[PDB]
Amino acid sequence: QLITVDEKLDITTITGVPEEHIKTRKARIFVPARNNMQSGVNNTKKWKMEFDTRERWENPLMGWASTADPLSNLVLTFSTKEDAVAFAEKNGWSYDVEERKVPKPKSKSYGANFSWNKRTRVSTK
Amino acid sequence: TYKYVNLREPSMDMKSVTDRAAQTLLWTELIRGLGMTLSYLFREPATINYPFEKGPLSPRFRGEHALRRYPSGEERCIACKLCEAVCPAQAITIEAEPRADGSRRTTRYDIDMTKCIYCGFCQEACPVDAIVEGPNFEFSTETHEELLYNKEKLLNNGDKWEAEIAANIQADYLYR
Amino acid sequence: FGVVFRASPRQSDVMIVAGTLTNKMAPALRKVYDQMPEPRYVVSMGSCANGGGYYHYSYSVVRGCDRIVPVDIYVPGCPPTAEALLYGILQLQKKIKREKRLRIWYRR
Amino acid sequence: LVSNLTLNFGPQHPAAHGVLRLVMELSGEMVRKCDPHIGLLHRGTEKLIEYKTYLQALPYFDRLDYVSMMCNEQAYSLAVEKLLNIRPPPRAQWIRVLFGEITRLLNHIMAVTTHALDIGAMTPFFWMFEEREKMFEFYERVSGARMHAAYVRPGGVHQDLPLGLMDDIYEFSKNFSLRIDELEEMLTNNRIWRNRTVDIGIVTAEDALNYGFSGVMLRGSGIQWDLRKTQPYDVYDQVEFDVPIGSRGDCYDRYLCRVEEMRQSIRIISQCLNKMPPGEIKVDDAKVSPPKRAEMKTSMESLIHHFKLYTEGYQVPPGATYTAIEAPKGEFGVYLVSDGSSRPYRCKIKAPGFAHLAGLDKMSKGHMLADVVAIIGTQDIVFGEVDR
Amino acid sequence: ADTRPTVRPRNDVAHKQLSAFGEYVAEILPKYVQQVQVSCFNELEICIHPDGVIPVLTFLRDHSNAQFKSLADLTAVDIPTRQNRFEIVYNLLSLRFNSRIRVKTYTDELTPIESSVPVYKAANWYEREIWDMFGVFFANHPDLRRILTDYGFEGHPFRKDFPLSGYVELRYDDEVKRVVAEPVELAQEFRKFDLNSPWEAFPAYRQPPE
Amino acid sequence: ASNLIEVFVDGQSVMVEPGTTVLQACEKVGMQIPRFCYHERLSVAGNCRMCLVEIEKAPKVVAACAMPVMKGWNILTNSEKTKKAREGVMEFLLANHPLDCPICDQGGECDLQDQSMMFGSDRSRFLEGKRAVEDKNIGPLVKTIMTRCIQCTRCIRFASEIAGVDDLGTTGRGNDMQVGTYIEKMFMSELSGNIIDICPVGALTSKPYAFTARPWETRKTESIDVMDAVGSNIVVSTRTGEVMRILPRMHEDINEEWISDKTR
Amino acid sequence: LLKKTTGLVGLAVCETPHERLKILYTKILDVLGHIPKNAAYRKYTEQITNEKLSMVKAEPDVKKLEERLQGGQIEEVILQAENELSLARKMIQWKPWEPLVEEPPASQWKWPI
Amino acid sequence: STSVKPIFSRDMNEAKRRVRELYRAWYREVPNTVHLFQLDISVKQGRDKVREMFKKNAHITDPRVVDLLVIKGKMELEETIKVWKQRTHVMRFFHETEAPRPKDFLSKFYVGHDP
Amino acid sequence: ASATRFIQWLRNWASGRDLQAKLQLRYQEISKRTQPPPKLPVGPSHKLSNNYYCTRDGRREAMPPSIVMSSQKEKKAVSPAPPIKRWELSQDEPYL
Amino acid sequence: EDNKQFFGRHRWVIYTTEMNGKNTFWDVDGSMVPPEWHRWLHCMTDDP
Amino acid sequence: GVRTSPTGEKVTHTGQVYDDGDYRKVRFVGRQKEVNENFAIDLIAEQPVSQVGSRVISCDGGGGALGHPRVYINLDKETKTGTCGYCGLQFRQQHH
């Protein structure tokens, strides 16, 4: 019916990635920062995974940005931290997790702009 | 609503049968086949004479990308990277820096005429009608490197054909 | 122009690589190339047979047939309008017309 | 198995349907088994599309079935419209139908002629291909590209028809039916053609359903099924045409069906030209339909929506769907999956030639070696969509 | 139907029928069916435990009210954010009743799904493709092997963690007189544009907080 | 705790501290009220009126950013009465705005191209002339093209409440009003470079970075700065192996979202 | 009176549809006996066979019968019946009516991610 | 819990069986492969290469994985047996043209950046 | 069309058609290459009153799928839809 | 030009015997057509 | 203005030139470094300033739909000439 396998899950040997990219690349797990130029926070939800950077040299003929690493443009989206960690564990890439940094909400109050004895009051609008 | 294609019943009357028997022993329908071919011998071939003649085209035709200039002479392109961001094949490369007179203009602008798919999106997304596609198509080259057009090559083509590109755009800018 | 429609690949005179060149299909192309009696002129047609065209960044696409064989004429356009392709063939004939084998031989 | 032969089309002959490596297991003269190898043209289209915007991805669907172009784009367009929850304007639906039939004329001409080219019948290849050349201009005069028009897009079409075109399509249609009658005058009644495609590749009605056939394969053995009649999409509910049905099931009927479909296309075009309505050509919803250059260069909102729809594209509501059309070859559809972003998450392409080819083994049982020529051709297999 | 050319006219009648036909299958095979949902564009979805591939597909093919004779499509959707990363999908057609239903399962790399070839001969090759491109294994398949990828492709392409440019690019070498392979090097790297807008697009689909 | 008071957001009750703004309450359930003149690190002004939202059973739409919430309220954030407010407000902000997107630096990362697409109407009914303002030269860092300014008073509150300087301000009245210093004075301060970010439009763009690269072709890469001991978190925006710019990265403990001018 | 062809390839003509159908529907009802009477499959399969069989008796002529059955060609009803019957036997081995075999993970069918 | 559906082998003891079955399949096929494709490596070299690919998977422990690794092997062998592969595909395991990639530390620090 | 009268009759007789009426080549009936400038119609939403986008919202009117039966939380047999009808033989030309 | 032939063969160009230093008496190619005449020659417009 | 380097190579309007030691110029051997001599920066400076009455003047590059988007140029400042961002043509208020 159903066997009981009691080993750490690992599929490093079947995915087909050359080992050069398995034990060497240092995947990165993080909640993407907010692009400071905008106040929209719809892209700070899903945990993205990515690898480390590698050199991009210049094609002599046209000065383009050539590259050798095939995983440079690789990005994956995971719903929570654990779902991402497992996918790295069962492939061999040494991962590094970074804690979500939730903006500490502030106590905004319009009525403070006009204070009798508080320095918060503004001299203009 | 449908219809039947091969559901004919051969009437078994002697005359009809004799016809199907006449057809086999006299090859009549095959004799007919030699008829249609004979007619086409005495028709007029639809062959044009190239290069002394050309196949009819239309103002919307897509050809060799080129870069335009205002009537003054200035470059129309302002390095807005819409064409790069839409070229499906990513055949466009662009760089820009503020020119001496502080006007947004390109420094490196390359189109890979081997990665291009000739889709016409680039000329659709240009907000200033800078990058277009001329009516030229006879630009086969003996080497791969020749088919990598950078800013200088594109500008020359635009100047080279501009007498015609405007003529086509004039007749057709209304449909767009 | 004398350019017949069909010829035995082992009695050809020029190969017109038309379309994409998959990694799976690449070995067959090279095999065919070696069976062509000399002189053999290869003409790359289209944009996927030149630099991978639309599929330049596809794992299973040979980025330009020139990797597998040495091309003589490159025809752009995906697809190159039937007239443009004819220009290339005419252009190829001139390219032949600018060949001076014997002269170079006489000056060996 | 007696002597397995790797019959290869790699040295492609003048058929222009792709490259096919075929592995068979003969028994003397008669074939006994088949095993097509189809990886020879797999480019990975279904994977790249996951990096493109829905707009950027449209040209791929043009290069799947490179003899039924505008039909392919319509299939993709309907899927995006369906997920976008918007309808193209009524004028757009007629134009798309107007060219769907014209494309169906293009497809069959290739299918019937080349299917006759392979069997040595060479003259009919040219005559009809001349009409293909004339029809290419209609493609070229609306979209500027002879084949890969990309004319049809999610939300209607791109540019309206130029003046003097409909008055020129009518000219083509009127005399066209004479062209077919010339074609039949050398294929239908000819006894040599009959000997090659009668009692050949007979497909049982129940099997056709089970293997997953569609199009002239299903309707070539009696099955009454045409998505233009049961599940119409644009306007086909507002036209009159008779879905031809064969009864024998052999190749001959499918050849008859295709020739009959072309005539039933003319009966439709005759109705498209007369009923063509006025109005705009694209959905008047700027967020999905980028404005014409006139408004872009004049109005603020009209520019922004021309600055995002050509760099980021339009977002699509999360979801997935399967939409199919009666493409010339057979059922064609896409299982598009959208996760809310402007790029599709997944797009499976149900190529009608994929199933019609897997079933070649079944159809090839107990037929001579030369008959696989008349069997592969009758299925109208183009390896652009088999591999994708 | 409504007088708004820029919106899609709803067809509620067909939507109601699917909901009515919904419980019809949920009641009949409750051992497998986990979740049945109907989308607003008139498409029925049936969620089945993977074991019930044959009981459920075989049922609809032959029952006296389903009669789904032909298999429209068969693929999988890689989704690395779930424990069962892959997700099979069967699209079924019904000429008699003129309707289409979609049946989905869930599996992973190491949990094969019983071949549905017995139910439909259509899935003879579609199941080769899923294995070829995704890696899912189908039990009891008559002949399972690569159908698309190149011979000896050390990897499963359509997985979301497979780089678009692959791992080896071919080339012809004169020294050995044969095509060869090497680690991939690109003259120009694939530029990775970032498109996501940072503002919520559709409030309807909003995922609640964590 | 008993401090909280239940407030509904489309009926979905959530408890929030008294004095919580309407916008903050709607943020908990994940609804980000659209805004132009609000920044939680800058005192409230409430003048863009892009954040106006509906309050259940009341004839007036209340400004989200400033309005305190009272017990037992419901905040319809998707009704038609709320879409009408936004479409109208976005109808005005794009009236006098110029067609500078193809040459404006923010094009691609603009709060006006996004919030216009998502919330604003899709077409304009403006048949008149346009406003045009003359530029200012207030430093060799912050390129200024005030024709695109939309009077958010971010640049104003920021300077008076973050950098501590009081040079930026608004002069004039009504539509004639302008934002500037009124005299040829270079607004210089180690933090001066941070108005390039808060300004949601192309009215204040970095001069060194100007005409360098569109936002959608750069590959961000989180890192840290070493120009000084504070160690500000930063995102090193790059492209084709070339550092194209440096931007702040949020971190409350260290530097909120500010980076000194030298680091920028 | 009897049809010459069925309109399909590989579906021959039944000489006596009336007699053939009465066998099958009656045969089917026999198989359904084992299936528990509370099972949903039996409850609905029973109904859809009683009505089908009942109309077989009423019409003496083949043509008028079909337009009431609404199963297409009369032969197609027969071949439909066989598959319907063959299913019934298998259902007894599977026992679908049993409780759910196993619930899905917490967020298996969640979309979007 | 670890209740998992197996593929073929219920435990390593059975799973390891097919591995030895498989190894013989290659070990007896290398002689055919060299002659069939007219490669230019002695029959000895192939088996030595064969051991390597088997050897690098010695560390495996999961019964399912070994079934999977085995399943791929049959396909690789079946293509080789039937001559579906081509002379090129056979030699891709040996990496002829690839020049010696440095692997010690001081070698890397002199040539480039790759760690 | 240039074909002489004698040739015109011959290719009609051999093919048994009025070839001259329906010729394969275009002579002048085509549209002229140049046409007066067009003036395209505008869309139905081009208005300056009571045309708020929120009413003609193409996408936001869509909603997630509806769930019929979910495992987490006397009836007539129902078909998926009404059975197909029988197509009527084409009376324009039922038989080829 | 001759408008009495079918479409396509009614507008043809005879190539000079010399141009830009090339003896084009024989080696005539379609790229020698100046841009202004291209629009007319390829039947893209009516007025020469 | 095509001003050539001492090494003898032309300089483009972008200023790029293969300096003395770089090997990359070897490609030109037997061929030519194609450059366009119609330097954009020069030609615009040739075009003259235009005098306007009001403080605001609208530029569209001429032709309406065939030119760049419409932009309104302030001209209050008299110590400098207003410039159109897209086309670069200059404007100035007169006698004030």
Ligand code: SF4
């Ligand atoms: S035609 Fe299309 S593919 Fe070619 S350069 Fe223009 S946008 Fe790119």
Ligand code: SF4
């Ligand atoms: S779209 Fe036009 S203006 Fe913008 S960068 Fe491209 S060519 Fe230049």
Ligand code: SF4
């Ligand atoms: S700030 Fe810039 S990008 Fe945003 S709307 Fe204004 S011009 Fe366009």
Ligand code: SF4
């Ligand atoms: S300068 Fe920028 S931040 Fe200041 S009011 Fe204008 S748009 Fe707002």
Ligand code: FES
């Ligand atoms: S954010 Fe509330 S009025 Fe501006």
Ligand SMILES: [K+]
């Ligand atoms: K800013």
Ligand SMILES: [Zn+2]
């Ligand atoms: Zn201007």
